[PDB]
From Swiss-Prot:
Taxonomic placement: Eukaryota, Metazoa, Chordata, Craniata, Vertebrata
This protein's name: DNA cross-link repair 1A protein
Function: May be required for DNA interstrand cross-link repair. Also required for checkpoint mediated cell cycle arrest in early prophase in response to mitotic spindle poisons. Possesses beta-lactamase activity, catalyzing the hydrolysis of penicillin G and nitrocefin. Exhibits no activity towards other beta-lactam antibiotic classes including cephalosporins (cefotaxime) and carbapenems (imipenem).
Subcellular location: Nucleus
Family note: Belongs to the DNA repair metallo-beta-lactamase (DRMBL) family.
Tissue: Expressed in brain, heart, kidney, liver, pancreas, placenta and skeletal muscle.
Top-rank taxon: Eukaryota
Induction context: During mitosis. The mRNA encoding this protein contains an internal ribosome entry site (IRES) in its 5'-UTR. This 5'-UTR generally suppresses translation while specifically promoting expression during mitosis, when cap-dependent translation may be impaired.
Signal peptide (UniProt feature, chain positions): none
Section covered of the full-length record: 700 to 1040 of 1040
Name of the encoding gene: DCLRE1A
Subunit and partners: Binds constitutively to TP53BP1. Binds CDC27, which is itself a component of the anaphase promoting complex (APC). Binds PIAS1.
Organism: Homo sapiens (Human)
């Protein structure tokens, strides 16, 4: 049944709750972003109102064929009224179109639902600064102190420098980048920019990218693989067997592959700096796992929450085990005692 951490008290609302059938008493279904664990359940047969960003609404219409009459896109950073309740959508710094949702309950309670987010100090100057938030529904994906990672800018600097050196040393090398969802577009777009190439990809993935309002996108991507030396493939194909097979397909145009897997966290992070990352190599194929995250590090999460000073925290990730729930609650209490709220 629908878990309590997907329901907004004092409303008829749910958040990311599309796989439970008709949720009894739900008058508006919100969707924070287009990732499958969150939209699971939606299709052309859905006939309840869906509230979301413009970008998420483009993907619902074009990829899932949800009918236009049930898509309700809202502008960001704008006070809107939904079924009699004031809401605001904020940028979540996750994937394209991802939002956090502020609810202003008729009784005076203010609720923030972060959806999935990568906390950032820039959020301390949004419409969040303007009033008190009583309850926080928090993306706790990496809520433990072992999870450190570099800035997205440092990681993209490493990828660009690695790629540019490799292809300048060997103009017959091919660059390949894995993907299995929207997000992390900067990885493949920044590398294609430094090399003077478009990114080549399947018709399905090109369609998906054309929904994202990215400026000048027609100049950066293509379905013509032959004219491109940065290829995108499913994340599943980013292994030595999958890559040897792809290289055969390119008909002797290339004699080397340099591949990137933008993982979340991996335990090489506890020891190794970005400067010191090395690939796995077999023959003329090298694979780099790079820690490009679209979720908060532990320290980023902690800073946001200590700034916001909520009265109650409701985790939305890692809630399935008692040891995880107990560990998170201990960190929440530490943060509150250290900061004094
Ligand atoms: Ni997500």
């Amino acid at each position: 049944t629908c878990p309590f951490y997907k329901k907004i008290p004092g409303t008829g609302f749910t958040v990311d709750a599309f796989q439970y059938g008709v949720v009894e008493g739900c008058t508006a279904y919100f969707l924070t972003h287009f990732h499958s664990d969150h939209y699971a359940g939606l299709s052309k047969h859905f006939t309840f109102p869906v509230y979301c960003s413009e970008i998420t609404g483009n993907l619902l219409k074009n990829k899932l064929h949800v009918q236009e009459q049930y898509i309700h896109p809202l502008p960001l950073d704008t006070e809107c009224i939904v079924n009699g309740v004031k809401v605001v959508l904020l940028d979540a710094n996750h994937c394209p179109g991802a939002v956090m949702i502020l609810f202003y309950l008729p009784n005076g309670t203010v609720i923030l639902h972060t959806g999935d987010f990568r906390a950032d100090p820039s959020m301390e100057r949004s419409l969040l600064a303007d009033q008190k938030v009583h309850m926080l529904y928090l993306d706790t994906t990496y809520c433990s102190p072992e999870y450190t990672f570099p800035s997205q800018q440092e990681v993209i600097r490493f990828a660009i420098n690695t790629a540019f050196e490799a292809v300048t040393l060997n103009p017959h090398a091919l660059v390949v980048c894995g993907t299995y969802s929207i997000g992390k577009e900067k990885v493949f777009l920044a590398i294609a920019d430094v090399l003077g190439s478009k990114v080549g990809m399947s018709q399905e993935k090109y369609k998906t990218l054309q929904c994202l309002n990215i400026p000048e996108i027609n100049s950066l991507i293509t379905t013509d693989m032959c004219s491109s030396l940065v290829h995108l493939l499913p994340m599943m194909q980013i292994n030595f067997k999958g890559l040897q097979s792809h290289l055969k397909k390119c008909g002797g145009k290339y004699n080397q592959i340099l591949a990137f897997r933008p993982t979340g966290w991996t335990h090489s992070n506890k020891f190794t700096r970005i400067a010191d990352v090395i690939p796995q190599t077999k023959g003329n194929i090298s694979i780099y796992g790079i820690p490009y995250s679209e979720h908060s590090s532990y320290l980023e999460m902690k800073r946001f929450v200590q700034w916001l000073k909520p009265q109650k925290i409701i985790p939305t990730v890692n809630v399935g085990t008692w040891k995880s729930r107990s560990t998170m609650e201990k960190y929440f209490r530490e943060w509150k005692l250290e900061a004094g709220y």
